[PDB]
Amino acid sequence: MAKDDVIQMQGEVIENLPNATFRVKLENGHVVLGHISGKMRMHYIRILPGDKVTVELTPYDLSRARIVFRAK
Numbered sequence: 628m629a630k631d632d633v634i635q636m637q638g639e640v641i642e643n644l645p646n647a648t649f650r651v652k653l654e655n656g657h658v659v660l661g662h663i664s665g666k667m668r669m670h671y672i673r674i675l676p677g678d679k680v681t682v683e684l685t686p687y688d689l690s691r692a693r694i695v696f697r698a699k
Contacts (some may be wrong), residue, residue: 632686637698640678649674649694653681659684663694 638651640659652658659682663674665688 633683635681635683635695636692637679637681640674640676640680643674643676649680651680651694653682657689659691661692661693661694664698665697 636653636659637657637673640649641652642650644650647662647664648660649663650658650660661682679698681698682692683695685690
């Protein structure tokens with residue numbers, strides 16, 4: 628199936644920063660920085676270092692992605 632250049636990766640949080648920003652490391656070890664938003668995200672969720680979450684990398688670069696809900 629064809630589509631944009633968006634790909635969901637499975638990584639774990641490594642650090643936590645303000646501005647609704649968070650860092651997660653993929654399988655290669657590289658950490659990506661992004662922001663978390665949405666419905667379940669506005670429910671005052673609990674985030675901590677070591678949690679499995681999904682992140683969608685953008686074509687802009689490999690140093691900025693979108694924070695997605697936890698890894699199913």
